[PDB]
Subunit: 298 residues, 4 copies
């Protein structure tokens, strides 16, 4: 089973003119590795993959992979709407030394099933890396159903997991039963902080979630506690993760909220975000603060 445990969708730190902030992004990466995370996921939703051009994503992936220097497994998110671009980026990910790619379904056209299976097969056939599907229906307008994920895992041996980004116990549970029942080492990670504990208890594999950026100790210690069999301690950490997603309500996109939380939790990085995200206002920054304080995270 590949890419299990706590794997944060790392934020891409930018300068004020919108270029990659190498020192900042590097410090972030080093904090998270130091925190004990089980991998790193660059150019996810929170990574602002969809506000970036192709060449920029290449640059960011290459840098990110380099700085990690194989200390933990790296995942590059290579998806989008342009299928050829997905292949290009996916192969580049491979050449640049990534351990795997994370591919979302195309999100402008909601593609026929035949075409969706065709698309995921083509991108899977373009690399020899393990490939993680990415479901996020709230944003895509098209759900990767458990049945269809099972069709994809049945078709290609390199389709070996999924980040399931949905506030739904039923989708997580059904994903686990349908897909892991057919493919026991196929990996199921939830996309939201408040579903980690549940995902574990359902027979799933972990979380890729935003709180990994500014508070990875909480998810890392939950996982460690669960693995040591100490469920009580694990549910205690869970109690914090249940509360954390209130902050994501402060803006849309909440990519700015995450960065501001990194700062407030002790890592001073530029919080610049790419449009059409925008700087979080001081009132809401302050409201974010009281929240992090309330939960004993700063």
């Amino acid at each position: 089973a590949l890419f299990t445990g706590i794997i944060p969708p790392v934020s891409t730190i930018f300068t004020a003119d919108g270029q990659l902030d190498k020192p900042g992004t590097a410090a972030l990466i080093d904090d998270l590795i130091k925190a004990g995370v089980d991998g790193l996921f660059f150019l996810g939703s929170g990574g602002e993959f969809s506000q970036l051009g192709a060449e920029e994503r290449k640059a960011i992936a290459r840098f990110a992979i380099d700085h990690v220097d194989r200390r933990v497994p790296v995942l590059i998110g290579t998806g989008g709407t342009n299928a050829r671009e997905t292949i290009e980026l996916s192969q580049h990910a491979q050449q640049a030394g990534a351990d795997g790619i994370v591919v979302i379904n195309p999100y402008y056209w909601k593609v026929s099933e035949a075409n969706l299976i065709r698309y995921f097969e083509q991108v899977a056939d373009s690399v020899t890396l393990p490939v993680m599907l990415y479901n996020f229906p709230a944003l895509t307008g098209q759900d990767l159903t458990p049945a269809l994920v099972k069709t994809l895992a049945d078709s290609r041996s390199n389709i070996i997991g999924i980040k399931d980004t949905i506030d739904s116990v039923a989708h997580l549970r059904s994903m686990i039963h349908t897909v892991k029942g057919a493919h026991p080492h196929f990996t199921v990670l939830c996309g939201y902080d408040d579903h980690l504990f549940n995902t574990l208890l359902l027979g799933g594999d972990g979380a890729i979630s935003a709180s990994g950026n500014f508070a990875p100790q909480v998810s890392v210690n939950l996982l460690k506690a669960w693995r040591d069999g100490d469920v009580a301690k694990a549910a205690g950490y869970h109690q914090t993760l249940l509360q954390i997603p209130q902050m994501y309500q402060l803006d849309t996109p909440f990519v700015n909220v995450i960065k501001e939380a990194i700062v407030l939790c002790g890592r001073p990085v530029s919080t610049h975000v790419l449009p059409p995200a925008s700087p979080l206002d001081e009132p809401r920054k302050a409201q974010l603060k009281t929240l992090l304080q309330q939960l004993k995270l700063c």
Copy 2:
């Protein structure tokens, strides 16, 4: 805080010709009281309130109240689309000795907000009983938003709780913060089994959920365990409740599934259901069995 803890939406046992089965529905009630539940909810969704005429619901409520004989608090579900009928049934609930009513938003027309607030105020003003709101958007097509529930609790002192029926941690959490933050003794119960533990850990009040019919020990012991501070034991029970809602996938309406589960778990009652529900087929009955067995419930 009224109507906290484990309060099952009790199944209405029917004869083959569709009349109330007094011996069966009585035995069911007695099992649940014996199991240690904290109240009983008749004529909920699972109670088949919406396949029943007015006079039948009256008869069922009266019988149900009488059999309970004040051993636990009783809630009568009195809602529907016909507002006058809701008042009638709500007052009758009162005369018949109910401890409270449970009122869903009208579910054919999606009511303007002005009318929805007006409707709930008029029903609340028709009784001196405590009143529970009932959110179930999947079926109603209109969500009782935390903000709006807070407007209702602000308006009427007898609107003192909610059964929130949705597979969503965000709605439960937002419901607790918005409404309980403004009204600390306002009751928040979840409508699904897999959300009980989470509901508790979020500062909510319990569950009204189907598994209370055929497996109330699980929810009752979870609650007891959590109240005694033993979180580990409580999460263990939670592990079973995470799995239970698979069975509700076997039919729609799954009212039949619940009854069949009552039987399989040791209480031999007629499983007749009112159309347009229908008898569960033997294959799926058998699939329900293996599931209950897998989970150590029969």
Copy 3:
């Protein structure tokens, strides 16, 4: 082909104390028959069927049928959530002398396909009257798909039409091709005023729509014009019907709006409506007026 042409969903006139207003409802009926409509539909959505108890609907149907006295075909809307009640009401419609029933899909539980087909078959088998399906997905949360309507017409020879209530050319066109291609004399009526002309031009059969209450001349003359081959004149009337549905935005439910429009267009009836509908306020009454005036309808 049964129930073609202009068939209004007639408003049920109530007194200020909420009783059937026999003089008013009778005058309304007589105006419409005099306007040249092709039938009458009582206890539709606009008829307030879902705010009424069973016995009241019987009383209203019986009265309505009796007053019409076979001058035009009468349709009784007998649907709801309670299947047994649907049969009861449907048979009563028959005994009372109705020419057909109009049956919507159950709208609380969104019923499995197997159960939905089973339900419509059972109701169709309970009478010898022609049966009109009623699709209104915005309110039901479950669409009667063309394919499924074709399965129902294929199963029962007395399922002979549909009122399709949806703002969509695609659903209307798809309904016509799938169902009428298989069953040429199967009737397709649209539920909205602005789709009548289109429904005709697509090879459909007419309209059941609210404007038939207060402005049936417009739809009746459109139909007449189209039947005489004078498309220009028919599109002229269409121009008015395109504008009319603005008024339905004034309240929800807009059953009040329709009644107020009946008055303003020259028929002085009580505009009382059953909760949770409410009296339209004077401002909006006035806005309704300017609208009817600007369109040359009062």
Copy 4:
């Protein structure tokens, strides 16, 4: 009033190796200009804008503008998910000699209203060209509401119109009343073929729709007929446009369908499409054929 009448979203012809087909795309353009259209819209949805990288869209826009050589007004679709890319592409559109841009709302993140207004203002401020909004909620997951389109037209003098892509008379009518009532020369075009006639009769301005590629005579003649006051002739053409959108059901994306229809209607171009669209199969190609034949278009 800018960009009124029939303005096709032109297909981008690609070679078999996926490069811009200059001869084919040029012949297409010349057929449409010859057909009497009122403008041309490159890199729309049908233009495959979202399967293309930035540099390719520039190349296509430049070529398209140059070939048109000011014979009709040209619109370049410059939108997407990357805001900076939208500005870049928008300015380039300007330098390259475009008469206007067409900008859709960002369609991955569904952006807060504040950020959406901010985004459209920023892209509008990056050019001096007239700017056409593009609503397509089925694909975007976020509707450009009439109210909001009115807030945008109120804010920026160069936001002067909209292509409204939705199967809904209400949205079109509400768009016209809200926005044109405030801004009489603000242009409202519908995105679907079957809504053109209605859009005209509602006081709107025309259509940008796929049938303009392979059958522009129909829309052009409808417009001409309506403008000459001959409504009958105009509704006749409308009858064909009502039927045409059946073909778009043959695939998703239906970009392939449109190209195949161009061929079948007499213009032999490469029908290659960019993934994740794929070649239409022969059966469906043949079904497309019978359809075009049925309607007297080949």
